[PDB]
Specification:
Chain lengths: 242, 173, 49, 93, 124
RNA sequence: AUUCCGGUUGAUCCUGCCGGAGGCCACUGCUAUGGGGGUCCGACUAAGCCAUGCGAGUCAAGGGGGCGUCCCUUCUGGGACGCCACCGGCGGACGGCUCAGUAACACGUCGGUAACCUACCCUCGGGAGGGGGAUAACCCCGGGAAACUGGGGCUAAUCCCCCAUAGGCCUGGGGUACUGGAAGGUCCCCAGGCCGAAAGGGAGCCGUAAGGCCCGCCCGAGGAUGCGGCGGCGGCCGAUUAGGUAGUUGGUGGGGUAACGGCCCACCAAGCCGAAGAUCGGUACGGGCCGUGAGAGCGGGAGCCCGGAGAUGGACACUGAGACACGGGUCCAGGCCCUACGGGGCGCAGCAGGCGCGAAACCUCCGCAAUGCGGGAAACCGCGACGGGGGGACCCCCAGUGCCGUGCCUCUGGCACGGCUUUUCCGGAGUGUAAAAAGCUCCGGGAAUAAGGGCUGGGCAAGGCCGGUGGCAGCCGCCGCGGUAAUACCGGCGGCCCGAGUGGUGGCCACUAUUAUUGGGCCUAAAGCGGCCGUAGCCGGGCCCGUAAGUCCCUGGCGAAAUCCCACGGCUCAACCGUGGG
């Protein structure tokens, strides 16, 4: 039987979100732990070799990553197992090419191209708030990152809010709160890749999460859980959202 | 997981009536073995199964599959372009047998005889849409039916080849 | 199965059929039991010994 | 006769990837040297910095696909390319 | 092997066979049996995932905490009563909840010495 | 696609069973399987034994030595490359292999962990002070047949250690801000005690030095990878196994665990399970799926993916973040290999192969590459993972073994003449090897060069004459044939089915409304009890008021992939694969 951690991943076992030819070869690059969850990310090696076609074989992708000619949210990352998740900005300054990873209507992930001025803003979903000794508030984001603020600024934030972050230097720009009427992009569920406006809340006790009701651009009404309601704007989207 | 046979054996393979019907469908179209004929029956069969499944089926996806069924049947050239889901039932084995490439080449007059057409096909002297197909059992779409010509490098493409004029006069005669 | 013949035995058919059918008593290597084994084919038992 | 369908430029690698079709109706499939010599002509490339990946000749077809690769410097070619493809085209003994 | 594994008999009493051998994670350690003495003797134990557990084998001093909240690091004379087991009070063995006699008086222990390594108590 | 037919009588109807007729899986005869393209092979026996080679490493940018060479300078000595092995960081707990064990919270799904852990990863806040010590390699020296191994000098590390403070832990009192429905925890103060950090670094640019880039060390807090244990429901057979359990069930209070928990201990009490099948026995890895069938349904779990478990049987421990650890260690049992006999060491349910078993399953091959893993930031390295190839009537798709005109017959098929393609072979050129081959792809000379297996009385309609045998030899799935004229035996000829296949046996579903819910029978053939009563259970009068458990409709999450169906696209179409839909 198994006596410790897994170090491989059979291709057939790959997550459902990856555009990968499942019957090509046996294995797949097991992602290493990182910002996002297993469900909602992909190794950048597939992004380079496959989604961009820049490298055909893997060896040349090792080399191009070693040259550090990429900027994932304003940081060169040579770790080919790095997981690139939702709302992260892939930037190639050499070609001036900027894309943002977004989920598709089918639930897979895709690179939406974006302009340069958009490239340094990133929205972080405030996953939780934890106090650290010395009374320093710490916001844990949806992408395995943390930021520190003061006690007097704790009222400003709440869990599940969105924070548009100047990622290349880690500076808070604005905070999109939650109340009725916010523009929202859905991350998971059969309502994936849906953009609409918040209508109503649904409080359920007993560990049953909160459910929002979203109206679509034309007015169709549907429902989805809290944690999938990624707020991007209060009235209109602040980013080019397919 | 195993790859299963695509055709079906007769339930009783020694009925005189069915045996003779198979024989008279064999001699005319000149197929090699009963595998081919049973296969050609089989695609008809599951077309009918699809028709029956979708006729009773409700819901939008049923409509989508129905439209795709009609569309591909038309694209095959098996049905008139204004057909409905009804007349698909009344198809016959012969209807598919005309759509065989081997039949089509004979009906284009390029061959005096069935087996001659088959031999030319397997010998790669017949091209479709600029591409050579070596399977006389290949099924031809409607849209392709006018692109069937001699293979360009083949001598039979040459009008003066010693095997062209008897074909030609047989077509004329 | 694979076995060793130990003896040739003929058998009278069942009436109203009449005739003599040859066979051999065979000890079986797999488990050791002894069982009769009919020999088919006309003029064939000569080739079993 | 060679006719191109698409030429792409990997600025990250500094490389030109080109896909082309060889019409050779009634002709044997051409070698690597001849296709290289013809291809380098109209594209204005240094033949020593250009290599050909594959020339796939399909069944029952007179059009054979070909995929070729052109660098801008010797050392990127030496550092990125596997050795065996260079050996095939003769750029390494 | 001190095995803190599964029970071997069903709630109905059906005797369960062992389907698999014992694993490293499902076994405990020996009972510490803290005892009174003139000095404090301690031992560090490597545990699951590289953590450490400190274990006391001799006890000499205690932390008696006032109802107000102050603390006093005093010496231990003897154990008065051990409600957990009668054998332990006789043998001068200290565990949580034991009532012990010190220079201040009677103190009920509210710390586990086998894991904390220190004895904390509340006077009565 | 919802099919029947032969067999009980002098003749008929019925019941009932058997045989034919189809597919899948094993074994096997004959016959070739020529050609190609996508897939399988100790799957039920010995989880029996095994010679053998290979299958697991990488880093000298952490460290310090030695050896060789180059170059320059040579008292010295620097730098370049390679080797040596060591310290040491990481890996060797994943991957490969099998189904013995297990009737189990082993498994499937749905929830809870607030009752846990987490090395390599990401991010926010902070830190790297002082001091000390260690011995390999090498030089002197030895045993034994060996394994293996002694002793003196000797050296540095991010090797080891002490202290400094953060910080880790536990408790009493007092407040309060936060996740959250809440809990308790988290936040802060006071109080008491225990434990208790690091590591800098090779090269290079600028810089006199420093200082900026690169890699790396440590604390707090999360996230995330992997995991642990908790629960509801689901899913075999035996009643010629009816009572079972002894910490066995719960309560008090504690030990032990990373963690809750009788898990364990002490005391208390008598509980827990059973006819809705306890206990005991037989039997078996569970699931996605697979074979057959019109479908209800019936069966099966080997190849692929998930979870489970195991290394000759058993038992046990170190190091580790992770093991009681296939190619680490110790003992017993049992088997075996080497030896001046003091003692040693072995272990293919890894790849390839042998012995054994048996009806029954392959080459002691080539590369580290395409994919992917560990290491090294980088080059790259290794891998019997994997990828290629090798043998095999393993599965599915395609394909022919001649075509045409004339004349004669056996006019159905063949025969003779004339012409025609060259299904192979030979040569050249592409992929491709991450090398040749892979015969794949295009061109040139060119045979017309690969067709057999079964059946021929009827059920199966399915195909008829002549010789030999003469109740013998013989034939047969069932009925049935043969004692002189055999359309049923053997031979010849003829003919019929299928076709690179065909035949025989065994196993499974259909046939079978011969398991019957859909949907079977019990007056005379199998079967309504020799009678009545009545408990659980099952079925239950009408109307009115209420609930809304069942029932139905809408909507959130979820039930992985591969597989099933469909359109389009790619390999010549197809098998296979991709995108989209179900």
């Amino acid at each position: 039987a198994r006596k410790g951690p897994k170090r491989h991943l059979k291709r057939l076992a790959a997550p459902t979100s990856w555009y990968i030819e499942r019957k090509a070869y046996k294995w797949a690059v097991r992602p290493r732990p990182g910002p996002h969850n297993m469900r909602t990310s992909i190794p950048l090696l597939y992004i380079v070799r496959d989604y961009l076609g820049y490298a055909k074989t893997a060896r040349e992708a090792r080399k191009i990553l070693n040259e550090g000619k990429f900027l994932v949210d304003g940081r060169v990352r040579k770790d080919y197992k790095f997981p690139v998740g939702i709302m992260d900005v892939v930037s190639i300054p050499e070609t001036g090419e900027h894309y943002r990873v977004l989920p598709n209507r089918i639930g897979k992930l895709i690179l939406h191209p974006i302009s340069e001025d958009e490239a340094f803003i990133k929205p972080l979903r405030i996953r939780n708030k934890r106090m650290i000794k010395g009374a320093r508030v710490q916001l844990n984001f949806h992408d395995g990152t943390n930021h520190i603020v003061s006690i007097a600024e704790k009222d400003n934030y709440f869990t599940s809010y969105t924070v548009l972050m100047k990622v290349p230097e880690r500076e808070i720009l604005e905070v999109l709160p939650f109340e009725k009427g916010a523009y929202v992009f859905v991350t998971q569920g059969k309502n994936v890749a849906r953009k609409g406006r918040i209508v109503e809340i649904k409080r359920f006790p007993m560990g049953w999460p909160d459910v929002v009701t979203i109206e679509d651009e034309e007015g169709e009404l549907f429902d989805t859980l809290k944690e999938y309601a990624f707020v991007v704007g209060t009235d209109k989207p602040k980013i080019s959202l397919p | 997981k195993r790859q299963r046979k695509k055709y079906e054996t007769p339930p009783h393979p020694w009925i005189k009536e069915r045996l003779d019907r198979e024989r008279v469908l064999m001699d005319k179209y000149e197929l090699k073995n009963k595998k081919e004929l049973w296969k050609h029956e089989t695609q008809l069969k599951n077309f009918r199964r699809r028709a029956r499944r979708l006729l009773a089926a409700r819901g939008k996806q049923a409509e989508i599959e129905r439209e795709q069924l009609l569309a591909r049947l038309k694209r095959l050239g098996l049905l008139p372009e204004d057909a409905v889901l009804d007349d698909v039932l009344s198809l016959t084995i012969e209807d598919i047998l005309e759509r065989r490439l081997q039949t089509i080449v004979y009906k284009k007059g390029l061959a005096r005889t069935m087996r001659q057409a088959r031999q030319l096909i397997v010998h790669g002297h017949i091209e479709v849409n600029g591409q050579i197909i070596r399977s006389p059992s290949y099924l031809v779409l409607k849209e392709e039916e006018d692109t069937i010509t001699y293979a360009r490098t083949s001598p039979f493409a040459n009008p003066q080849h010693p095997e062209r004029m008897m074909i030609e006069k047989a077509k004329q005669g | 199965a694979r076995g060793i013949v130990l003896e040739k035995i003929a058998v009278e058919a069942k009436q109203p059929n009449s005739g003599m059918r040859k066979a051999v008593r065979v000890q079986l290597i797999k488990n050791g039991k002894v069982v009769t084994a009919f020999c088919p084919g006309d003029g064939a038992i000569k080739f079993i010994d | 006769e060679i006719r191109i369908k698409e030429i792409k430029e990997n600025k990250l690698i500094g490389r030109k990837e080109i896909y082309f079709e060889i019409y050779h109706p009634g002709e044997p499939t051409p070698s690597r040297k001849d296709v290289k010599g013809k291809l380098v002509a109209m594209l204005d490339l240094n033949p020593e910095t250009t290599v050909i990946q594959y020339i796939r000749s399909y069944f029952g077809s007179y059009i054979s696909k070909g995929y070729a690769k052109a660098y801008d410097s010797k050392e990127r070619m030496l550092y990125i390319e596997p050795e065996y493809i260079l050996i095939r085209d003769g750029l390494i003994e | 092997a001190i095995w803190q594994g599964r029970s071997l008999k069903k709630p109905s009493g059906g005797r369960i066979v062992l389907a698999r051998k014992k694993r490293k994670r499902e076994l405990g350690r020996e009972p510490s049996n803290t005892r009174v003495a003139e000095q404090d003797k301690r031992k560090i134990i490597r545990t699951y995932g590289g953590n450490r557990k400190v274990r006391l084998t001799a006890a000499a001093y205690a932390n008696v905490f006032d109802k107000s909240g102050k603390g006093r690091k005093v010496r231990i004379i003897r154990v008065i009563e051990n409600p957990a087991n009668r054998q332990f009070a006789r043998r001068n063995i200290i565990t949580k909840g034991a009532i012990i006699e010190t220079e201040i008086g009677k103190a009920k222990v509210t710390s586990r010495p086998g894991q904390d390594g220190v004895v904390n108590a509340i006077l009565l």
